């Protein structure tokens, strides 16, 4: 409706609270496996952030899986940095991790992260 | 980390996408029953927004329930307005619904909504 009021902080508060659920392992429903490193998460958060997880969890068979194995070329630290970004809006982009973060964001289909990586890399050359 | 960059729109985008999942009935895992009106939702979103649902879904028995029946004194339109607020940050507060919205927000333990209702009511008198 056009008569709505809006609580500016609501979306950020929701995200902070979803990250608290993740930290306390509350109602996490999938394990993402990256070269034997395991990450517990919520399928809905993964889907809301990534084109790859959205395609995975809308599949009629894959939606029922409790474990998803990522391509072995995917770097676990790169995945971890992206999983933290999904739950917090914060991206720990560093010189020593930028290539793995960009490669993982391209695989996960996270266009905004890909864009900032391309900008940081182009500025370095 | 202190070296993090932040994507300002991320939290709002996540919330918009969780509401798209709700609209398309994707991975909804609970039905909230309010005087025979039914509302499909995601337990994690309900918990991230409401002190009542956080207490419910952290309970070792209630966490497994796929249906939660609310007190019969709860108004379904009031609940619907609050469920939309949870997923969008927007509250459709109107003269004809403010009392039911405030009563439902007090029951759901949604303090920010209670606060704005108290302000709108005090301004009317």
């Amino acid at each position: 409706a056009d008569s709505c009021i809006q609580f500016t902080r609501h979306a950020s508060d929701v995200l902070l609270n979803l990250n608290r659920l993740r930290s306390r392992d509350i109602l996490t429903d999938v394990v993402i496996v990256v070269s034997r490193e395991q990450f517990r998460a919520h399928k809905t958060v993964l889907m809301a952030c990534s084109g790859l997880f959205y395609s995975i969890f809308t599949d009629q068979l894959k939606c029922n899986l409790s474990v998803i194995n990522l391509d072995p070329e995917i770097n676990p630290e790169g995945f971890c940095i992206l999983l933290d970004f999904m739950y917090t809006s914060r991206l720990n982009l560093r010189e020593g991790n930028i290539m793995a973060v960009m490669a993982t964001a391209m695989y996960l289909q996270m266009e905004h992260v890909v864009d900032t990586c391309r900008k940081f890399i182009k500025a370095s050359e | 980390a202190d070296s993090c960059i932040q994507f300002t729109r991320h939290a709002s985008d996540v919330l918009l996408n969780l509401n798209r999942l709700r609209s398309r009935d994707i991975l909804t895992d609970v039905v909230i029953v309010v005087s025979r009106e039914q509302f499909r939702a995601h337990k994690t979103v309900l918990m991230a927004c409401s002190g009542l649902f956080y207490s419910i879904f952290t309970d070792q028995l209630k966490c497994n329930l796929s249906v939660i029946n609310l007190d019969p004194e709860i108004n379904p339109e009031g609940f619907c307005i609050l469920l939309d607020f949870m997923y969008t940050s927007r509250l459709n507060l109107r003269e004809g619904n403010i009392m039911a919205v405030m009563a439902t927000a007090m029951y759901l333990q949604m303090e920010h909504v209670v606060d704005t209702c108290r302000k709108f009511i005090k301004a009317s008198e």
């Binding site: 009021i5 809006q6 609580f7 500016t8 | 940050s89 920010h112």
Partner: peptide
């Protein structure tokens, strides 16, 4: 917070 969106 609350605003007119």
């Amino acid at each position: 917070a609350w605003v007119i969106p």
